[PDB]
Amino acid sequence: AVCPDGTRVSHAACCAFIPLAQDLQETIFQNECGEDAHEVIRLTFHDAIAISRSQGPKAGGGADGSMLLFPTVEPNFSANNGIDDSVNNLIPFMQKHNTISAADLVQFAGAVALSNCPGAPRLEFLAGRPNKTIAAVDGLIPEPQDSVTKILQRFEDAGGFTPFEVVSLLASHSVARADKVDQTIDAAPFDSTPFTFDTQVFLEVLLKGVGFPGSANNTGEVASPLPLGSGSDTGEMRLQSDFALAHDPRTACIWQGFVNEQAFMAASFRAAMSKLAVLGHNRNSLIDCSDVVPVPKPATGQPAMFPASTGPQDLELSCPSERFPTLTTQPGASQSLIAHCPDGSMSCPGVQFNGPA
Ligand code: HEM
Ligand SMILES: *[C@@H]1O[C@H](CO)[C@@H](O[C@@H]2O[C@H](CO)[C@@H](O)[C@H](O)[C@H]2NC(C)=O)[C@H](O)[C@H]1NC(C)=O
Ligand SMILES: *[C@H]1O[C@H](CO)[C@@H](O)[C@H](O)[C@@H]1O
Ligand SMILES: [Ca+2]
Ligand SMILES: [Ca+2]
Structure with missing residues (x-):
């Protein structure tokens, strides 16, 4: 037509x-x-x-x-x-x-x-x-405080999704931030590249947590490896559910298998x-x-990389049967701020309509 x-x-x-x-x-x-x-x-x-x-x-x-x-x-x-x-x-x-x-x-x-x-x-x-x-x-x-058993069952009951398909769908957390988990901060990203559909979330959830982007006592949240924020540039948040999936025997190898595997991740996301x-x-x-x-x-087309302030020594690995890749580390002694805007600027307010919801 x-x-x-x-x-x-x-x-x-x-x-x-x-x-x-x-x-x-x-x-x-x-x-x-x-x-x-x-x-x-x-x-x-x-x-x-x-x-x-x-x-x-x-x-x-x-x-x-x-x-x-x-x-x-x-x-x-x-x-x-x-x-x-x-x-x-x-x-x-x-x-x-x-x-x-x-x-x-x-x-x-x-x-x-x-x-x-x-x-x-x-x-x-x-x-x-x-x-x-x-x-x-x-x-x-599903809610971030939920167990892996509960999450997997919810997805099985909704549509017969396999654990592979569930973790595949979580590639969306590569482009995702949280406003409600912690009342005190806005737009806490789940990876260091929340405007880029890359594999950083899979890598970064596997790093040892060292603090919180806001408060330490929120339901559904665990320690983050990149908690530093300043101004509008809120630190990284880690969900309990993502953490749990990254370490559970049912899903750990699937989670790791997306690290530094962009094409695989994207194709798997498309299929799910x-x-x-x-x-x-x-x-x-x-x-x-x-x-x-x-x-x-x-x-x-660039490989995944450890953010500055992290490295291989910080990994918390949970997949005995698959070798964790060799990745470079971005230079620098301390954490870089994760920009609040796609262009790195000081202002990028989103259009919002009022409505019934
Ligand atoms: C076990 C499953 C999942 C759980 C527990 C979960 C949980 C969450 C939570 C708690 C947030 C933050 C909301 C807030 O406080 O503002 C969030 C954000 C987000 N989630 Fe998930 N999620 C899951 C699966 C998914 C899937 C399957 C998709 C889509 C394919 C998805 C896409 C997103 C996106 C894009 C955001 C960011 C929203 C924003 O930045 O405004 N999530 N998720
Ligand atoms: C689908 O349903 C919605 C909700 O009933 C329809 O929305 C209405 O759209 C008309 C214009 O066609 C507006 O005058 C109304 O104000 C809308 N209603 C509401 C509650 O927002 C929509 O038109 C329907 N779409 C299709 C393809 O049938
Ligand atoms: C981002 O910023 C940090 C400093 O906060 C650096 O260590 C890193 O090299 C990058 O420039
Ligand atoms: Ca619906
Ligand atoms: Ca990303």
Whole structure:
């Protein structure tokens, strides 16, 4: 089909996603892997994962736009703290781009957001999810204080995800920060490169923790290897769940296996996201609109490296059967600040709409 803008695409039903991508980029992401992009990526997961094989369809419909269509229900669950901003940012697009279901909007917006993160894959994007659903029930969203048994079971019950697929999906913590875990600090990144879809999170969670970016007593948090912050440049935070996954016998080798393995990580993330994005649907009933996902920014191709103030002597290794790679260390005696903005500048406020969530 040829779309009104002249773009030739696979299927006529994919045309409306072209102006949606442009609007999302111009309005909320600015082609950056920044605050608003991160928030949308998280929303893609919280929308999709609220489904349960065991509980049946009344517990939730998966990747169904329930977050947008019932903005006063799930976003107010404690496990969804902070999801409100992303919901409020996407509702105006749902209202304007009113040929595209809320469910499809969520998944597409995440694909567009991810495309702004150097190294990310170009997600598969299938379209045609209905615009009607139910609000999900509480308890379906993994929380950082949860055990590996509980996490793995939650993902198995949501969609048959394997441990490999779970850890693959956690590549998203390469482009992720926390506002709610610690009340006293904002935007605490989970790796030293929160604007770059690289393997640094996998490396950095394996380092010995030496302090906290904020306070020491938060649920779901453990000591960080890079806790130094100053001004807007908050120190790295470590989630208990990521730590636990990195060390548990079920997942330690998978976790380590992504260190310095960018292409492997990105491909594995793509495959798991292909499954996540269609929870609640038969994929054989959705049309393939992958060709209207923007082309992602490429990695530079550089290997993972130990951040300054860390090195191999700081590793806490847990995979007996796989050799930990040889990596360089960035020079310097003390920790570098992790920039708050994609350009290293002093100001980069994200666009935010008010709304019902
Ligand atoms: C065991 C599973 C997981 C747990 C326990 C978990 C937990 C968390 C927590 C606690 C935060 C910080 C929220 C805040 O305080 O502001 C966060 C952020 C984030 N998570 Fe996860 N997460 C998990 C899986 C995922 C997956 C599967 C994805 C997507 C594929 C995802 C994407 C993100 C993103 C992009 C952010 C950053 C949001 C921002 O910077 O605004 N997470 N996660
Ligand atoms: C999907 O459902 C939503 C929610 O009902 C629809 O949103 C409405 O969109 C119209 C414009 O078409 C606006 O006038 C309303 O204000 C919106 N309602 C709400 C509650 O925000 C949306 O149009 C539907 N989309 C599709 C593809 O059917
Ligand atoms: C980042 O900053 C630290 C200092 O805070 C250095 O040690 C490192 O070399 C890099 O310049
Ligand atoms: Ca949902
Ligand atoms: Ca990163």
